[PDB]
Amino acid sequence: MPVRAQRIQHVMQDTIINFYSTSDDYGDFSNFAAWPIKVDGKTWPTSEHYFQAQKFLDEKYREEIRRVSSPMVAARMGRDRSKPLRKNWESVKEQVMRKALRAKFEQHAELRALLLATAPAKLVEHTENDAYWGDGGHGKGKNRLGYLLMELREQLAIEKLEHHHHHH
Template identity: 55%
Template sequence: MTIYFYSTCEKYGCFSNFSPHGFELDEFYWPTSEHYFQAQKFVGTPHADQIRQVKTPKDAARMGRERSRPLRPDWEQVKDDIMRKAVLRKFETHADIREELLCTGDELIVENAPGDYYWGCGADGSGKNMLGQILVEVREILRLSNQQ
């Protein structure tokens, strides 16, 4: 069975970067993993802090996509590792959602995002599903750390 997620109000909504599961990372508190991810596009600039402080993950995403802001030059090289770092910290911080992720066993996890062919599966299922792949990696990291 494949586990699909997208909206925060559906089953497995906690897998979404918009889920309200904040955490501390890089000496700051982040309301969602979306806030952290989008802010990292502008790390070391006032833009990063502006994004960290906005009310909703939707606002953080919108601000992160504004090309009027100076995107860091290495973004394409570092974005997967930044996403992995944020998702891991989110699940390390919250026992309830960590348990939900671990209870998915060895199932494939897919972000059912019709408009996103990189982080999600895209409208036709041909997307890379990088967020789903990262969730599977994080599940394995958490599983191994539970065994120690």
């Protein structure tokens, strides 16, 4: 498990990367990776914390999910869909998660460089459990999480393509 930029030093081409193992270096691609993210002025343990903090419009409950350092606890008490959810929650998942992913890979140059390293490959989350944001084990999980990572990577590439500085 090497924490490096370019885990695979320039991937092949059209390489379908099916990853499931949050215990090693390929686990960072899984959003459930416990990498501290700095979002909107606060430090969130994982993306799910910010994700479900926007999920619920419960004032004091957001504070709870913001305070809980443990990632699995956020999933546990955030699991419930009986609580008042945002009317646009079904749509704004892409918005909230996109910014969370942004903060994750951007706040860590290691991860950002790792992200562009997986180009031009295709990232596929393979959770043999809950096929959501990841195409699952059966191939129908809405893997657009990995796609958000692809499109985010391209945005980071555009910013990088703005390279114009008197040093290199």
